[PDB]
């Protein structure tokens, strides 16, 4: 079975220190291996100060959002 957010679904970042904290990003892929601590790879429209907009997150650091339960205006 698939564990974690669905591919391509918007998620809100719950990692306090992340540049996109409480912001929204699109899930690229979730590594379906139990040993991976940060499988959820999320892509963001905004780039951080390192000019990188893709990062991996833990399962508990991302909140999957429904198709219309978030704010489209960020």
């Amino acid at each position: 079975a698939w564990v974690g957010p669905k591919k391509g679904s918007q998620v809100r970042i719950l990692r306090p220190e992340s540049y996109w904290f409480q912001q929204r990003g699109t899930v690229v892929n979730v590594n379906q291996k139990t040993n991976i601590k940060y499988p959820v790879t999320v892509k963001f429209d905004f780039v951080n100060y390192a000019n990188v907009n893709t990062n991996g997150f833990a399962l508990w650091e991302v909140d999957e959002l429904k198709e219309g339960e978030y704010d489209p205006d960020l």
Binding site: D45, F46, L74
Partner: protein, 161 residues
């Protein structure tokens, strides 16, 4: 090159100060009259340009009367550019003394204020890079110093000559 530009500014500023004081001293000396032929020293430069206090009193403070008393006269523009040059030069000090990180954190707080009101610019606000900050500071420093000297020299040499 960034530091050498400051030192070039210092060098050329001292050079033009030397030239301007020598020029004014020669103009005053040739304004002996005709009979006065013992200039002794006089030569305000030759008699006073031997101290830092001598410069600060008899050149900068002495000739600044023309540029600071220019209000209401055609040299009021020189006075205003004098003030603006001082302003730009202190703004340079702002850019040169400070650093990128602080301004980045300040912009983070300001950008939170923006996001709170659904403003959210997408060209993400980043403060000037370290080299960009140094370059802006140097540009403002050169502009302010050179403009101050420009206004001072022009007001002094137009009002008195």
């Amino acid at each position: 090159v960034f530091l050498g530009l400051f030192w070039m500014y210092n060098s050329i500023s001292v050079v033009i100060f030397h030239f301007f004081w020598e020029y004014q001293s020669n103009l005053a000396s040739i304004k002996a009259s005709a009979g006065g032929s013992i200039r002794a020293l006089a030569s305000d430069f030759e008699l006073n340009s031997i101290n830092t206090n001598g410069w600060l009193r008899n050149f900068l403070w002495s000739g600044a009367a023309q540029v600071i008393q220019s209000y209401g006269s055609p040299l009021a523009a020189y006075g205003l550019t004098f003030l603006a040059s001082h302003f730009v030069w202190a703004l340079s000090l702002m850019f040169l003394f400070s650093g990128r990180g602080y301004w980045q954190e300040l912009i983070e707080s300001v950008l939170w204020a923006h996001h709170k009101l659904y403003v959210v610019p997408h060209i993400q606000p980043r403060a000037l890079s370290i080299t960009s900050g140094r370059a802006v500071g140097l540009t403002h420093y050169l502009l302010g110093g050179i403009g101050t000297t420009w206004s001072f020299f022009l007001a002094r040499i137009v009002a008195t000559a």
